[PDB]
mmCIF file of C-alpha atoms and ligand atoms in Angstrom:
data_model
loop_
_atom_site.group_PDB
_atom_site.id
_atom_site.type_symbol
_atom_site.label_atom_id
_atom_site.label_comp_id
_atom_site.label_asym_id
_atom_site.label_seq_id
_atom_site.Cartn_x
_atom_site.Cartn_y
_atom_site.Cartn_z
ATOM 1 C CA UNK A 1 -32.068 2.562 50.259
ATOM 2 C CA UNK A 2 -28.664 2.451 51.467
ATOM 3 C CA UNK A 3 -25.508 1.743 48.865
ATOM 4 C CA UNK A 4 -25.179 -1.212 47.406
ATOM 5 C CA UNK A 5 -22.844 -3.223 48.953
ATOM 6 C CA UNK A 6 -20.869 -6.921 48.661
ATOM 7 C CA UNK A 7 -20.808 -10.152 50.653
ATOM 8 C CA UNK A 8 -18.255 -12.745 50.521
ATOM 9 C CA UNK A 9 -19.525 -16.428 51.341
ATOM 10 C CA UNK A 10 -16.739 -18.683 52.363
ATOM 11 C CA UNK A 11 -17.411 -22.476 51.025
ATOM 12 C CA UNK A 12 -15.595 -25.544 51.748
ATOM 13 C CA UNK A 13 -15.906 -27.755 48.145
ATOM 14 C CA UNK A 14 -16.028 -27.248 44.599
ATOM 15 C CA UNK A 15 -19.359 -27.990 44.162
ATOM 16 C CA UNK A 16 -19.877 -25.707 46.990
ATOM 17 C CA UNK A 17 -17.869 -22.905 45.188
ATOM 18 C CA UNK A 18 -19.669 -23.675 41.843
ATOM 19 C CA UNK A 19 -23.823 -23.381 43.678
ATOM 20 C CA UNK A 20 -22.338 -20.020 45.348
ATOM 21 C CA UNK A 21 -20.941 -18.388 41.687
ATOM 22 C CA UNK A 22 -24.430 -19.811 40.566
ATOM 23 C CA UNK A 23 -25.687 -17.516 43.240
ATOM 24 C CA UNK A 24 -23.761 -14.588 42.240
ATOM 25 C CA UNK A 25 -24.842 -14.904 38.518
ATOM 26 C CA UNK A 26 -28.451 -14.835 39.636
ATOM 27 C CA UNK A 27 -27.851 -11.547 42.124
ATOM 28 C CA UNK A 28 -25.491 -9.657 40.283
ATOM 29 C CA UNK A 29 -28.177 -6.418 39.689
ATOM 30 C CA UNK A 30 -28.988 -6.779 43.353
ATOM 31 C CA UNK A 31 -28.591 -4.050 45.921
ATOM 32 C CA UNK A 32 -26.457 -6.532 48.026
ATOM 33 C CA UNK A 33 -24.218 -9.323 45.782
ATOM 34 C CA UNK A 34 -22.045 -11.959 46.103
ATOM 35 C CA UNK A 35 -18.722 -13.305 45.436
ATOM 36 C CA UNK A 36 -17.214 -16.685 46.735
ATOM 37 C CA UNK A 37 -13.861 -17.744 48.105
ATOM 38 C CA UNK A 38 -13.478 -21.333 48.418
ATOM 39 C CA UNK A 39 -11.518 -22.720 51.479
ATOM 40 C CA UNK A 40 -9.860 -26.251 52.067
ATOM 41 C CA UNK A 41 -11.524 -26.644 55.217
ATOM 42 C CA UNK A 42 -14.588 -24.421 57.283
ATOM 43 C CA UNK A 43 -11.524 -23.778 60.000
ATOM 44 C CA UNK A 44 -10.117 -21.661 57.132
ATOM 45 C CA UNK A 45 -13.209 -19.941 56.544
ATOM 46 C CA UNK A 46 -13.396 -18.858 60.073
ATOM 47 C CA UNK A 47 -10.025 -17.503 59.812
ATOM 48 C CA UNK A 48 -10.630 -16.073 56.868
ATOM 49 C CA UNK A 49 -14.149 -14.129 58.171
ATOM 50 C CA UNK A 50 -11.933 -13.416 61.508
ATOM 51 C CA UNK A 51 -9.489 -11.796 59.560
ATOM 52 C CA UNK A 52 -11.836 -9.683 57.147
ATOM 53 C CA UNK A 53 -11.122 -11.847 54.042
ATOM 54 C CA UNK A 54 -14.638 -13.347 53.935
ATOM 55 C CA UNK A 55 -17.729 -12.272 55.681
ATOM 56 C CA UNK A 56 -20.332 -15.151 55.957
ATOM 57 C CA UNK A 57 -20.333 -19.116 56.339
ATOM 58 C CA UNK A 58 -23.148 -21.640 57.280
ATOM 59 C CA UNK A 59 -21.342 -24.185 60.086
ATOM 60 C CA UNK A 60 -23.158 -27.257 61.731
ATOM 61 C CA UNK A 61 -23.957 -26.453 65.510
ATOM 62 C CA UNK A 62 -20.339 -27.963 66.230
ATOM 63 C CA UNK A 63 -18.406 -25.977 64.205
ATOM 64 C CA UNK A 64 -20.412 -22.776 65.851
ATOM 65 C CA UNK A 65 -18.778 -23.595 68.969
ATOM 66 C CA UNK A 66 -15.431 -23.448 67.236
ATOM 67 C CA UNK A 67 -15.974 -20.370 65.260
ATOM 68 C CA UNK A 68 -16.949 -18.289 68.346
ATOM 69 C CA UNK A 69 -13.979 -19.209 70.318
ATOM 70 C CA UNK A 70 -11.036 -16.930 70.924
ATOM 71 C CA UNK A 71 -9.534 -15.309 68.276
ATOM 72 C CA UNK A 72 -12.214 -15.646 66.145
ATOM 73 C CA UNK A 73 -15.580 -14.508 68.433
ATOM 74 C CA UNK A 74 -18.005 -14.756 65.559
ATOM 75 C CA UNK A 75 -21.627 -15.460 66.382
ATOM 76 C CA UNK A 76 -24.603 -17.144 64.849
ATOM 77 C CA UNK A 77 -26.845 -14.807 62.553
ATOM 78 C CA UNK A 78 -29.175 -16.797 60.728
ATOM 79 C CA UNK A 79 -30.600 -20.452 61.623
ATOM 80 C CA UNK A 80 -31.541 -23.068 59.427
ATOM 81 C CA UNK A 81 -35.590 -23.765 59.613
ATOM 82 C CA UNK A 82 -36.466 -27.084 58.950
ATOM 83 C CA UNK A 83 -39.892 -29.143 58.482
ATOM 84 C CA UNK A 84 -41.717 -29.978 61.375
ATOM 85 C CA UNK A 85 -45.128 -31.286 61.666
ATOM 86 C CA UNK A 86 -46.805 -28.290 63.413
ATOM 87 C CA UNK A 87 -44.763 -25.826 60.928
ATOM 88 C CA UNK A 88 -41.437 -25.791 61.106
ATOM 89 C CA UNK A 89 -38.522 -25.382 63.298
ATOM 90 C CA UNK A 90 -35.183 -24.356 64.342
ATOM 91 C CA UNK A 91 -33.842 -28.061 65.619
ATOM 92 C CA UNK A 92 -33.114 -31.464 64.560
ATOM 93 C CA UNK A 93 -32.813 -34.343 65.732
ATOM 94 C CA UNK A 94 -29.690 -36.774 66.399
ATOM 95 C CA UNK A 95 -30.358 -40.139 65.113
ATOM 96 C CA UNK A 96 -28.258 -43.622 64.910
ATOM 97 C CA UNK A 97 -29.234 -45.189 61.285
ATOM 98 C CA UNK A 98 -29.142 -49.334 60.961
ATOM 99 C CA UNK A 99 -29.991 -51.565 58.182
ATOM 100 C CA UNK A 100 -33.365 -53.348 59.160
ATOM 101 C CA UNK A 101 -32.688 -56.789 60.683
ATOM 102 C CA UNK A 102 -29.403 -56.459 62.342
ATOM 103 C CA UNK A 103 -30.545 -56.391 65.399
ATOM 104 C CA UNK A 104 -28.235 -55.352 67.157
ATOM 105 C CA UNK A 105 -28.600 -52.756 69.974
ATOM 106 C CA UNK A 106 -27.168 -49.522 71.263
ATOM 107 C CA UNK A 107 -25.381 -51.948 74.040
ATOM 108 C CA UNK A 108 -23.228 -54.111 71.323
ATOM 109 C CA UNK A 109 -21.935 -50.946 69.547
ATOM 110 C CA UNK A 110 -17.979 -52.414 70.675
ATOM 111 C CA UNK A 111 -16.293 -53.660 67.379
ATOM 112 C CA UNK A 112 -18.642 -52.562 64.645
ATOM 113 C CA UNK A 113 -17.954 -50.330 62.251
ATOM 114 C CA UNK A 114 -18.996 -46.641 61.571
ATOM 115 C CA UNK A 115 -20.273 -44.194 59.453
ATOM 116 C CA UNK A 116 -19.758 -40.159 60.449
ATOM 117 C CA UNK A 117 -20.895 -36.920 59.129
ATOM 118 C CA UNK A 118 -17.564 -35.309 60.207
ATOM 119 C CA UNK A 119 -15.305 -34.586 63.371
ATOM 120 C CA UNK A 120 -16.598 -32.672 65.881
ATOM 121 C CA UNK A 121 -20.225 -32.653 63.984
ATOM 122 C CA UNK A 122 -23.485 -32.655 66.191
ATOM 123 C CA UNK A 123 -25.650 -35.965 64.907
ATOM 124 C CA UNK A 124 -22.031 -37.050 63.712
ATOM 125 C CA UNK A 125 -20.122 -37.078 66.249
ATOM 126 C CA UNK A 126 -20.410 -34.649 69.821
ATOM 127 C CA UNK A 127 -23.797 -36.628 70.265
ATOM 128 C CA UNK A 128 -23.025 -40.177 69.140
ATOM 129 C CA UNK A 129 -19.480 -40.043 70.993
ATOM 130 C CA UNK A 130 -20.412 -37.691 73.796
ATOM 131 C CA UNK A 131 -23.281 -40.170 74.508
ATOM 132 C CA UNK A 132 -21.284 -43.451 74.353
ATOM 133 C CA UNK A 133 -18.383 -41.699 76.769
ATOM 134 C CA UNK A 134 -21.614 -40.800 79.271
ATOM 135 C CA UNK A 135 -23.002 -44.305 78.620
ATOM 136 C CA UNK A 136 -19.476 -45.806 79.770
ATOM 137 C CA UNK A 137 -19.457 -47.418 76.234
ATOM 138 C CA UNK A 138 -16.442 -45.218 75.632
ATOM 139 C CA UNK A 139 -13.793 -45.041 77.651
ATOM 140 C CA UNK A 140 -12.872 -41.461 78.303
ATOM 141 C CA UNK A 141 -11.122 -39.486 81.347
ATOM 142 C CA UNK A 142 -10.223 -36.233 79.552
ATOM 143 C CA UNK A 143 -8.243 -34.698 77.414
ATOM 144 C CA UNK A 144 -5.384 -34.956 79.452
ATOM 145 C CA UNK A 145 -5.641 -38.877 79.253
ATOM 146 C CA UNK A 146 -5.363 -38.815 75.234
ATOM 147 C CA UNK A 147 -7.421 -37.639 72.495
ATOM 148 C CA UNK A 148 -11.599 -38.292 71.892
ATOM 149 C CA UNK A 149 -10.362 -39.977 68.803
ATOM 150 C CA UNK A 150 -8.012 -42.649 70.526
ATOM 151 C CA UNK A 151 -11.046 -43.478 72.636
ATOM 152 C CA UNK A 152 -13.344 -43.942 69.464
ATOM 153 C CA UNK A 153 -10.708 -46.181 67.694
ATOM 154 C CA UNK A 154 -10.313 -48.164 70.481
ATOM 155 C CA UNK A 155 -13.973 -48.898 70.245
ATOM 156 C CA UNK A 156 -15.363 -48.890 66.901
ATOM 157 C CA UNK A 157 -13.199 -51.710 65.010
ATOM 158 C CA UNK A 158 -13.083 -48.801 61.526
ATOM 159 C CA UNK A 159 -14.651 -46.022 60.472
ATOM 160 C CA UNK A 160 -15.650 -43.042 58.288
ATOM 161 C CA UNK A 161 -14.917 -40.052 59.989
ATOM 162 C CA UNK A 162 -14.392 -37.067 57.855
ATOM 163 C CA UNK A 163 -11.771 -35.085 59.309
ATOM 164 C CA UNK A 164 -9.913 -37.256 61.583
ATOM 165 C CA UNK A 165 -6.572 -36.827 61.562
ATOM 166 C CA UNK A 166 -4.879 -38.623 65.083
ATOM 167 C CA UNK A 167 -6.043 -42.236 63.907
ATOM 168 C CA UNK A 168 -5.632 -43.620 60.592
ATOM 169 C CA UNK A 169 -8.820 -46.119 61.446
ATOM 170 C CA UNK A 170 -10.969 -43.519 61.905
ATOM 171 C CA UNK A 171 -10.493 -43.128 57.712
ATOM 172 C CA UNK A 172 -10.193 -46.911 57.117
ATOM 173 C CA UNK A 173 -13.902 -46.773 56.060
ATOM 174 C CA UNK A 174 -13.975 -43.793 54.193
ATOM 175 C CA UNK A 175 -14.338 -44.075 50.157
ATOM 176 C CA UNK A 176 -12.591 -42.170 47.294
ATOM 177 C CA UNK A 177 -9.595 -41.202 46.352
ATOM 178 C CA UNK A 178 -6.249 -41.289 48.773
ATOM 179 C CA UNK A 179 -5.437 -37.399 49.218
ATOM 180 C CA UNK A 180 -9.436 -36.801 49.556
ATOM 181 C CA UNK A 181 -11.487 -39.984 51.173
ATOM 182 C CA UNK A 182 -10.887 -38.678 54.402
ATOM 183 C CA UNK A 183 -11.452 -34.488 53.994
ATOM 184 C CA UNK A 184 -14.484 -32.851 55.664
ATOM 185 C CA UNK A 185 -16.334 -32.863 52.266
ATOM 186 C CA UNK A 186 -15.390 -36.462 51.122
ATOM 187 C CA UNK A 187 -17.772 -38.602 49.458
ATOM 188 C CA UNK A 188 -18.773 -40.218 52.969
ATOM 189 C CA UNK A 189 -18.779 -36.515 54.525
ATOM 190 C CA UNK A 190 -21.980 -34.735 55.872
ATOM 191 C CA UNK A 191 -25.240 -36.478 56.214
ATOM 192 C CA UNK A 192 -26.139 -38.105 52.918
ATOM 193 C CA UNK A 193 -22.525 -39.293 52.662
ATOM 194 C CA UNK A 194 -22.761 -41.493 55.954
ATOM 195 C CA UNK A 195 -25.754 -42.886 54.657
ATOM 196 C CA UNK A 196 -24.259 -43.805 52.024
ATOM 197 C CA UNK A 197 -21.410 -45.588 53.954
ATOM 198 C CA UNK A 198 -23.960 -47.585 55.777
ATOM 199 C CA UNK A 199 -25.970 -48.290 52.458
ATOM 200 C CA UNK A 200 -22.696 -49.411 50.690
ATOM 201 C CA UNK A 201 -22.042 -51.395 53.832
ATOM 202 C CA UNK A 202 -18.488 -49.682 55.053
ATOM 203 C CA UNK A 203 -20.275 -48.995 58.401
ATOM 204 C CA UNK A 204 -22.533 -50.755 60.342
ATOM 205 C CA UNK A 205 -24.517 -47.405 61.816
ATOM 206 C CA UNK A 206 -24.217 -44.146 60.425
ATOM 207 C CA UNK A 207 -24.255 -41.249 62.849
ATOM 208 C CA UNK A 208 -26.847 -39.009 60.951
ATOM 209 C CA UNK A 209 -30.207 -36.697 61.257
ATOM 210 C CA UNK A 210 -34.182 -36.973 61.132
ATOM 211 C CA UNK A 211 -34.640 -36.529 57.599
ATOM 212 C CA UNK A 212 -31.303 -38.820 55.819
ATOM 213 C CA UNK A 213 -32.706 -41.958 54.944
ATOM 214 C CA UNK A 214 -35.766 -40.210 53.615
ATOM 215 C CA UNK A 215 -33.277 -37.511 51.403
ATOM 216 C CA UNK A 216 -31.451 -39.951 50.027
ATOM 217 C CA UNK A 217 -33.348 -43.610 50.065
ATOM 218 C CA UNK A 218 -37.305 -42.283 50.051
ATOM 219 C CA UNK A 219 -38.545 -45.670 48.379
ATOM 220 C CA UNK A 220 -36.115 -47.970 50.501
ATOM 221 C CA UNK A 221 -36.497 -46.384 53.395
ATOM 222 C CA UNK A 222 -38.259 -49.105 56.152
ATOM 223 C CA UNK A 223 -35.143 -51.510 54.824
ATOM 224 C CA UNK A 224 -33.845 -49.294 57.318
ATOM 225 C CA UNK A 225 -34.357 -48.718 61.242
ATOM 226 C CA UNK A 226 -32.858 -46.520 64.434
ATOM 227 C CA UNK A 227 -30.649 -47.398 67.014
ATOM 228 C CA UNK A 228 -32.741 -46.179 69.967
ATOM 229 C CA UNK A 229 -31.181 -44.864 73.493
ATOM 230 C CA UNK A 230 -33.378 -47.374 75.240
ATOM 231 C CA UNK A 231 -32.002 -50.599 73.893
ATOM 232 C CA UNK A 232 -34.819 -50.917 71.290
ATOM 233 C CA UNK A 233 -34.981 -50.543 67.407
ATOM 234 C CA UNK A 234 -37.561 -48.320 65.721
ATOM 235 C CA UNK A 235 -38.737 -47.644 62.422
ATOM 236 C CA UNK A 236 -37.012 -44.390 60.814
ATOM 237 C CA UNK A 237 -39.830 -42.263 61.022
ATOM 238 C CA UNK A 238 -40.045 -42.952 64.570
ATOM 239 C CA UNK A 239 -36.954 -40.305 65.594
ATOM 240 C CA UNK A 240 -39.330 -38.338 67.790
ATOM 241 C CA UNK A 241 -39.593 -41.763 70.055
ATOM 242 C CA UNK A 242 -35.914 -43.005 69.242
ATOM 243 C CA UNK A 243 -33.396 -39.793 69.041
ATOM 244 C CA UNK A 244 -30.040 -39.495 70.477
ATOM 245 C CA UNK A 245 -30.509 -35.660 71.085
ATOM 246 C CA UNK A 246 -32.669 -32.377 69.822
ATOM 247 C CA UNK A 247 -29.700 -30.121 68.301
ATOM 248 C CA UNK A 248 -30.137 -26.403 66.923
ATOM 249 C CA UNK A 249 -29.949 -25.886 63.460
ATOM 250 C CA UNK A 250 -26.779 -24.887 61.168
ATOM 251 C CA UNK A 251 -26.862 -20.936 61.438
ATOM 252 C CA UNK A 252 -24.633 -18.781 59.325
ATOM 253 C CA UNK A 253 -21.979 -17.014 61.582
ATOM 254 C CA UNK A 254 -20.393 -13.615 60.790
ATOM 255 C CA UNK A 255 -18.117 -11.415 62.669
ATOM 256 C CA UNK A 256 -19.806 -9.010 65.297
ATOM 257 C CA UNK A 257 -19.735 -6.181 63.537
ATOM 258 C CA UNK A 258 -21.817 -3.949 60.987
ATOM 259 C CA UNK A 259 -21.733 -6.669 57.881
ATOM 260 C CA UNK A 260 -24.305 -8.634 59.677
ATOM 261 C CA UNK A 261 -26.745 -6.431 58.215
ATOM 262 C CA UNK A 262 -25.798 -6.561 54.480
ATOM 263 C CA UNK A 263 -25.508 -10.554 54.778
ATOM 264 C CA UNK A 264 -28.709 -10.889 56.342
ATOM 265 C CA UNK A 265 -30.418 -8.240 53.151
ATOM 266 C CA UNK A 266 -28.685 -10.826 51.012
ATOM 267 C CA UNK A 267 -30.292 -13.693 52.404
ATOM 268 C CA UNK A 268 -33.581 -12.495 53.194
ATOM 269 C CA UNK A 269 -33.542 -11.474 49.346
ATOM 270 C CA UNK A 270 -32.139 -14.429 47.441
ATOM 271 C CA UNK A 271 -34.548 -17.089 50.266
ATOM 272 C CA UNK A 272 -37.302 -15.143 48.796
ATOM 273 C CA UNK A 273 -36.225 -15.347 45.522
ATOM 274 C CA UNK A 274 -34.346 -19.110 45.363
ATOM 275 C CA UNK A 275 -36.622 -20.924 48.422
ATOM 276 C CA UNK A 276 -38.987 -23.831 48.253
ATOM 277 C CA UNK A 277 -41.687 -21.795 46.307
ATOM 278 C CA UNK A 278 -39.193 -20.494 43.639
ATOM 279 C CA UNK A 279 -39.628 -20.444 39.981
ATOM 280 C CA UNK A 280 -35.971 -20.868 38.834
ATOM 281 C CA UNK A 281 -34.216 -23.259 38.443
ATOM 282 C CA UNK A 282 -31.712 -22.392 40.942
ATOM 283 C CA UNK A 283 -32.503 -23.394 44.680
ATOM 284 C CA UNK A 284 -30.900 -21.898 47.768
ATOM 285 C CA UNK A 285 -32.000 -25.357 49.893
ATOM 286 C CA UNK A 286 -31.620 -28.431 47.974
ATOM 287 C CA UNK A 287 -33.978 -30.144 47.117
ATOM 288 C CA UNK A 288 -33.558 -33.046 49.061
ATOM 289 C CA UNK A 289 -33.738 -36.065 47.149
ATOM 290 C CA UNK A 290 -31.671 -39.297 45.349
ATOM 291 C CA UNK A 291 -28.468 -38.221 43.895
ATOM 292 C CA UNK A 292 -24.761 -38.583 44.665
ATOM 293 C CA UNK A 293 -23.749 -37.389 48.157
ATOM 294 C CA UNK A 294 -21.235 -34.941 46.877
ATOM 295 C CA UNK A 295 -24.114 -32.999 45.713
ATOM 296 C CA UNK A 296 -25.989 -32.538 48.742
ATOM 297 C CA UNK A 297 -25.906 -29.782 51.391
ATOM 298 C CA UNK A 298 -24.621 -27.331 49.576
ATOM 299 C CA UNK A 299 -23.683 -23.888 50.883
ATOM 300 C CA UNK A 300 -27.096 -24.673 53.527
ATOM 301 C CA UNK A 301 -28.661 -28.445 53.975
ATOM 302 C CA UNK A 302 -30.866 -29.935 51.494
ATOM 303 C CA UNK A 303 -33.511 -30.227 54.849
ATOM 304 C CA UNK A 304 -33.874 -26.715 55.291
ATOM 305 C CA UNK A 305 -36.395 -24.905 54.291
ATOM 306 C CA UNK A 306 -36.030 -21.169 55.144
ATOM 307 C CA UNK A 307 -33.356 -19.133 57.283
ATOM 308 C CA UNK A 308 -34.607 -17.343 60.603
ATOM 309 C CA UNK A 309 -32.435 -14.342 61.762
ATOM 310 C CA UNK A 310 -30.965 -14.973 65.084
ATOM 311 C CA UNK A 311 -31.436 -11.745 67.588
ATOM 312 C CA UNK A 312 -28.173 -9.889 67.774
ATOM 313 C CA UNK A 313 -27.701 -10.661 71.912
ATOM 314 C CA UNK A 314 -27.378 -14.760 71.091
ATOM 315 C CA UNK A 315 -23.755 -15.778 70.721
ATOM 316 C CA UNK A 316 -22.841 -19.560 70.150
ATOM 317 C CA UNK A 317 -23.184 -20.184 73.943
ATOM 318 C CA UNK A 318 -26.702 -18.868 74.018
ATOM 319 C CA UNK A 319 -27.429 -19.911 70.429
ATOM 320 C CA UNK A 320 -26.263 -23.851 71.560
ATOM 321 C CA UNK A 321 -27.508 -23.589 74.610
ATOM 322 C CA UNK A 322 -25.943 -23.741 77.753
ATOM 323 C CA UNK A 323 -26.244 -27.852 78.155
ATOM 324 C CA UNK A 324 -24.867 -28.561 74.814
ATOM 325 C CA UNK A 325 -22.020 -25.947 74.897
ATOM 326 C CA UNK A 326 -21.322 -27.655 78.468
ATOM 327 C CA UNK A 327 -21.140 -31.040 76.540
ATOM 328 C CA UNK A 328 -18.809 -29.752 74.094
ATOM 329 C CA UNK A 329 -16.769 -27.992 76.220
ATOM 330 C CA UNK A 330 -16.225 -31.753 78.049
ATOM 331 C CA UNK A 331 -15.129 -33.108 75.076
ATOM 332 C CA UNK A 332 -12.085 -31.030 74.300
HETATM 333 FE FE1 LIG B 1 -25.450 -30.941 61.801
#
């Protein structure tokens, strides 16, 4: 086999940088290993890859469309697989997360407040938002006419939106300290934290996926219920009848170039090694499961279950899909 070789994973949080150097520990004697450069943000991570400082970062479908933009052009190597009932899959789905007996609907979304994985986040916000502007909820001509955030504030009385930085009530929600309630990886950042605003009742929905209430509240999990599109309420494991939107999975994105091939030996290795089935202690995904938000998607999401390689022809247009990129592409 060829050399042995080095791949640099970009991460966005301590705890982050502390799973990857766990990582490293545990590959050291591989063919391919692994060092870690922590970031304050994943926009510095793309930077960072674009610029041949880092090589490799896993990035929620939003954050793909960002990362393949000019000057940065990477693409999507690897998806995310997650559980699905005839095997698995490379999607998930968008849902709207309510405590059970609020009754309110999808149509009386005007003043309450909200929980969000994260600016410009699929479940968190492109598809909640993006949906409300369509739905004429939202008020929203453009760009042009004023930021996506102005038009949320206006409508949402507070919220917890990790990553906001136009309008201070888009943090009003948000818990911790003051320099850090309001970063990307916050306490009420990513999926579990969201939940976790709803649950500690800071938000009255929480903008999150398929799988959150049962990762983080398994045994309370019918005290919950989904916002559905149609005006109705349904039970949490109903998403497949009461989703927002299907969206394609977190993929790690690289620069186009030859590294793809040493990051994807790496993965391919340590999945086989650190997945579901392992024997160490240490695992790549997760596990899902009751603990403190902070904690949880780590370097990939608790919910996934393997990585898939992504053929070398998809870019993030192709990768999102044409629709979705389209819907992004209105948003900014
Ligand atoms: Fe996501």
């Amino acid at each position: 086999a060829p050399p042995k070789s080095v791949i640099r994973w970009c991460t966005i949080s301590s705890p982050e940088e502390k799973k990857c150097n766990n990582l490293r520990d545990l590959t050291q004697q591989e063919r391919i290993s692994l060092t870690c450069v922590q970031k304050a943000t994943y926009l510095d991570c793309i930077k960072a890859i674009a610029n041949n400082e880092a090589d490799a970062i896993s990035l929620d479908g939003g954050q793909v469309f960002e990362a393949g933009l000019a000057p940065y052009k990477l693409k999507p190597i690897a998806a995310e697989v997650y559980e699905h009932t005839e095997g698995s899959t490379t999607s998930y789905y968008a849902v709207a997360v309510v405590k059970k007996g609020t009754e309110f609907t999808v149509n009386d979304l005007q003043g309450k407040t909200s929980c969000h994985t994260g600016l410009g986040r699929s479940a968190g916000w492109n598809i909640p938002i993006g949906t409300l502007i369509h739905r004429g909820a939202i008020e929203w001509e453009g760009i042009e006419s004023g930021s996506v955030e102005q038009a949320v504030a206006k409508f949402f009385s507070a919220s917890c939106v990790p990553g906001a930085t136009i309008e201070q009530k888009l943090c009003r929600q948000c818990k911790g300290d003051p320099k850090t309630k309001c970063a990307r990886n916050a306490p009420y950042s990513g999926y579990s934290g969201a939940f976790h605003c709803l649950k500690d009742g800071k938000g009255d929905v929480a903008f999150v996926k398929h799988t959150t209430v049962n990762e983080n509240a398994p045994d309370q999990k019918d005290e919950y219920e989904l916002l559905c599109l149609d005006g109705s309420r349904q039970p949490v494991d109903n998403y497949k009848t009461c989703n927002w939107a299907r969206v394609a999975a977190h993929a790690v994105v690289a620069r186009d170039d030859n590294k793809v091939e040493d990051i994807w030996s790496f993965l391919s290795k340590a999945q086989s090694d650190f997945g579901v089935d392992t024997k160490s202690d240490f695992h790549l995904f997760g596990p899902p499961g009751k603990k403190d938000p902070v904690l949880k998607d780590l370097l990939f999401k608790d919910s996934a279950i393997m990585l898939k390689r992504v053929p070398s022809l998809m870019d993030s247009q192709l990768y999102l899909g044409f629709e979705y990129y389209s819907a992004i592409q209105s948003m900014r």
